[model samples]
Target: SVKSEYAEAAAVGQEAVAVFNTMKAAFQNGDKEAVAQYLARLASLYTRHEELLNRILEKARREGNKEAVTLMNEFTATFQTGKSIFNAMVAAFKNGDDDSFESYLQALEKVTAKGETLADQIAKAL
Candidate 1:
């Protein structure tokens, strides 16, 4: 069965936030290796959702679920933004600039905050 794009996307976003928070903790502990691993995990997470979106969005469009479609559309952009920022963060990491890494983590918070709100709304509607 096809899953709802809105639901899957929200789930993925929330999970990413949890992982990002863990990444921050690793950074704080001076665990460079862990930070590197977390960065890769976070990047892969967004990629995972991107793959899922193809089917999820297509199903939503076919079902005429505009609410899900619009939310998923917004999520796609958010994911892309994160991807770009993540690349910059990698550069920061390479240069041993933890401050820039922190800034990049902050960038993700905005997306995660919106994602949480959306998750709540979707659950309520369901």
Candidate 2:
């Protein structure tokens, strides 16, 4: 029921994927610290992303748009998954395990895939 442009929402997830790819390369370079540091930038982006989602979600709820609600829920899940990966990645940094970071990178890949899909869905739902 709300008239809105979804490009920003879509870009949020798309950009996260871009950052994750950068992190993957950093991991491959054996820079666990850089990987950790880059995740800080990711966290900053995701913080604003959450704020945006919360605003949209609140409006969607008020408008009683179940489709948008469902899309938002799915979209939110990707961020939740990324957050856990981030925690584990930080732990990997503490233990000095580039190999462990690789596993987290794999997890991030899955999250990114879902994020792209969810971004598309959110764009349509909006």
Name the best candidate (by TM-score): 2
Residue range 1-126, candidate 1, lDDT tens digits:
444555676688667778888988999999889988988988888788678766766776788878877776775676677678878888899998888988987886765565656545543432
The parts of candidate 1 lying over 4 Å away from their true place are 4-11, 122-126
lDDT of 2 by residue, 1-126 (tens): 343635675577568768878887887887767877788878787787777777888888888889988988877777778878877876887787878877886887777665776677777777
TM-score of each: 0.77, 0.81
Give the least accurate 10-residue stretch of model 2, judged by summed lDDT: 1-10
Give the C-alpha lDDT of model 2: 0.75
Instruction: List CA RMSD, all candidates.
Output: 2.7, 2.4
Model 1: lowest-lDDT 10 consecutive positions: 117-126
